From a paper:
The T4S system of H. pylori translocates the major effector protein CagA into gastric epithelial cells. As an essential component of the cagPAI T4S system core complex, CagX plays a critical role in CagA translocation into the host cell. CagX is presumed to be structurally and functionally homologous to VirB9 from the well studied VirB/D4 T4S of the plant pathogen Agrobacterium tumefaciens, although the two proteins have low sequence identity. Here, we report the expression, purification, crystallization, structure determination and analysis of the C-terminal domain of the CagX protein (CagXct).
The CagXct crystal structure was solved by MR and subjected to isotropic B-factor twin refinement in REFMAC5 at 1.4 Å resolution after the true space group had been established as monoclinic P21 with a β angle close to 90°, with the crystal forming a nonmerohedral twin. It contains two protein monomers with all residues built into the electron density, one PEG and two 2-propanol molecules and 129 waters. The two monomers of CagXct comprising the asymmetric unit can be superimposed with an r.m.s.d. of 0.38 Å over all 103 Cα atoms. To maintain structural similarity, many buried protein residues which form the protein core of TraO are conserved or substituted by residues with similar properties in CagX. Most amino-acid residues of strand β1, which runs antiparallel to TraN in TraO, are not conserved in CagX; however, the main chains of the matching residues of both these T4S proteins have the same conformation and solvent accessibility. Thus, it appears likely that the β-sheet interaction between TraO and TraN is reproduced in the Cag–CagT interface. Interestingly, one of the 2-propanol molecules binds to the main-chain N atom of the Ramachandran plot outlier Asp481 in monomer A in the CagXct structure. The main-chain N atom of the equivalent Gly258 in TraO forms a hydrogen bond to the main-chain O atom of Gly364 in TraF, with the positions of Gly364 and the 2-propanol ligand O atoms overlapping.
Author numbering: 1 to 103
Write the structure that this text describes.
Amino acid sequence: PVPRNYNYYQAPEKRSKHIMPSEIFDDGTFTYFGFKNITLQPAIFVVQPDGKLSMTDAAIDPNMTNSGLRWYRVNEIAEKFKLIKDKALVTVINKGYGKNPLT
């Protein structure tokens, strides 16, 4: 068992609701993005300090069934993610970044 940082929020662009996760948390090593079965799967990118984007090391975790969602494990902790599928964009903010997962 590892205390989780659940302190994330999403900021969808227009015509972007169809790619939004329902649950996002990190355990200090990995960031987990849970999507409803009905949601289309975006790519997940991280914002770098330069303002530029990077790919992540992301993949479906078949084992995880939490909340009836489709879960992706990202092998990184970051302050900002961009979820992209064609013109659809959701910015994810880790408000708990640099903080301990006690609170």
